[PDB]
Symmetry: D2
Amino acid sequence: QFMNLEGKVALVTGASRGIGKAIAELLAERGAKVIGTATSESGAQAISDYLGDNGKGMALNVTNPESIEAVLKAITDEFGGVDILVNNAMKEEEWSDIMETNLTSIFRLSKAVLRGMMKKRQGRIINVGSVVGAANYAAAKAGVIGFTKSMAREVASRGVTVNTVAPGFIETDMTKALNDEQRTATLAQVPAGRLGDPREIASAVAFLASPEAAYITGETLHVNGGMY
Amino acid sequence: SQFMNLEGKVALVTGASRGIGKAIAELLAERGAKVIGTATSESGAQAISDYLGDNGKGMALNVTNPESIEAVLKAITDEFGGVDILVNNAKEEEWSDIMETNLTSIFRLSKAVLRGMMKKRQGRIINVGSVVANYAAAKAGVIGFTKSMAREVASRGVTVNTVAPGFIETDMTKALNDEQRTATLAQVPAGRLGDPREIASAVAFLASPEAAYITGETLHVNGGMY
Amino acid sequence: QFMNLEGKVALVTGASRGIGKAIAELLAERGAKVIGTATSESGAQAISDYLGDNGKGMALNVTNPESIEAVLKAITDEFGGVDILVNNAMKEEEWSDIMETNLTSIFRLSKAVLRGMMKKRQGRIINVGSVVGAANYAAAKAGVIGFTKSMAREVASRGVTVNTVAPGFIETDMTKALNDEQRTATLAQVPAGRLGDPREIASAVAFLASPEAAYITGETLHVNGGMY
Amino acid sequence: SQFMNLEGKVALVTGASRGIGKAIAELLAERGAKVIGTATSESGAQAISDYLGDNGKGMALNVTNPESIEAVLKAITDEFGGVDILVNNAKEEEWSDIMETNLTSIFRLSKAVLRGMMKKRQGRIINVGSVVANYAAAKAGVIGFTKSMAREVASRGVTVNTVAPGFIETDMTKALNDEQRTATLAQVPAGRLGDPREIASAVAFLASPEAAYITGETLHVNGGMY
């Protein structure tokens, strides 16, 4: 009974590796039927292989409303309606790309799943913010929280919660590349004196996803070791 | 499973007699913790001991008195081991009493358990704020203090966090007049009162090994109130 | 001496009416040379007429980097470099329009003026957020603050401050349209029990613009009568 | 000009002897306010009276004592008129003293001036927080209290706000060792200490008729610290 996701259908974007993956795997351990996603059909297959009987991969282009419609219809058809949504992850271009990837795509896919969730008076939307390395990332991240809080207020009456998980410095593929010099400047900024693990983000997501977290909405949960 | 297991942890829950304090203690016991729940009197401590059974016991505790703190912690150290998880729960006369109950006592007891936690490089301090001016000042004080303490001790494996409840279903709420209830709901977007279990769920999460990288956080459980 | 803007060149976007106007007028009273802007040349003339000797209107398209370059060169040529910048003011389209008007345009024009400001070790950038009526507006507004805080940190060392003024419910052209029924629901939400005046936003902007406010940066100043 | 003029206002500034308290009192006097600056002793009150001259005077004040509060306010009411602007400026022994100086005293004196301000539908209460754990808890308490009080009294024309300074140039900072100064700057993005005038500028703004729609705000003057 305690924090069990048996009977839930979870849509995890960006499920191929790292945080996206660690989330998908944990939600699977907790009993959820996990549809993890990737921008390509190959990545979707890699997702399908690690999930096995606990779900599958699907190719998804969040910039395209038809690709969204078809994925949700497909999920509704095999699994039931998505109960849990987890949204994962200088020129004029870097800006407009970050705003699309880290903000607009988070808005669009959130609005899309809500129809079905509010029909059921039950849903969980969780937006995972970008892990720290800035203006562009800061602007998008604060935009998501902005949006999360307003959407939270509009839908709380209909049994849907909308929350954000804000990671600090997390041990990932990229972070190992930063040399022993650049390593220490990162740890200097964290009171814990260590990088966070992708499992720790997944733990925060799964809690918020649980029936136990039904009265938590419009919250930003920081997982940063005191780097605030 | 190893997921969110508190087996091997000793939890001190203040204000454990009823409602939120009780719901916390019970859940931490379900998760495998050895729970010492507290009350201001020896009778309340007995009531606590009866509901916990083999998963812990009740102790009398006066947080305004440093000696009563010292003796409770030595007693817990003696029967159970050092406290691993601390849950701090609880005109002029209005003010100075609120500042003592909802702030100073939270400071004092937090500082007291820290010695042992930093020796182990492992601890959890969780301050539960008051249910929704004197209360506002105390509550903001705790978060103030939680954040500064969090920074000082994160290096030594201790996390310090706050859980901030909204409007929660209690003894108190059965006296809410016909539309006085309606008046309170109007402020909560979720359209309902929160359950004490939901506060306990938030506490137990933050208490878990899984929440090691969460410190200096305020976790609001309010159905959208803010 | 006290809060005097004599010797400052202020660029106020959206200066045609209401808040934009009230800002431009006040900064003019305080001694600044005010270039107020509008999307058209006609609006720019209307601006020029109310400012008189204290500045002028210029047509500006913030979505176009060339229109930005040319306006700044023109200001540099007649007045000196901009010392103070004040940035003023559901389909897929409503979203992407709000993100452009209330966020991307605020980023772009901010980045553009910074070159000259950091050469002088002196500048003021102030972003006025949208007045309240939501997800789209909330997302953009929180994005601006997000961006304001990161940019503030990057440039504070070089004598530039970057701040936000966040208005509540403000008495404007639009707000009078809301009927005597819809009027009271607005006042219900404000502890003050009244709408704010556009002068009150302009007062907050001009303070932050002053030499006196040199140690204020990365701040969101709320002018909302307690509606927080 | 009528811009940010405090002519006709009576301002009470606690902690007016030196530094920030002084810089505040002086500026509010330049803006035309009748400034009563305070000190814990009668000698300090005299020093205050000497620098203010015709723009106000010094009074001795013990914020821990309700009678000392009552008598100072009656005295101000008697010579100047009711206070229009209040600027609240200022082991176990460490803690309970900080909570009294930086929090309870702020509460008490705020509540005291409110009576007269709400009768006039016009007032300004401004709490200056401590310069950068006990301090964190007090400071967060004041903002806590500021926000709850702000909500309760905004309808009656009184605004209540906080100014939160960062690292400011004082007596204290001349004792900062060669690179201990450098260590403190490292945390401030502006690369410099703030001037007491800059705190006074923020206070005087919020004190102005222009700032009538600002209430329940924390105004940080920190060069980007946060």
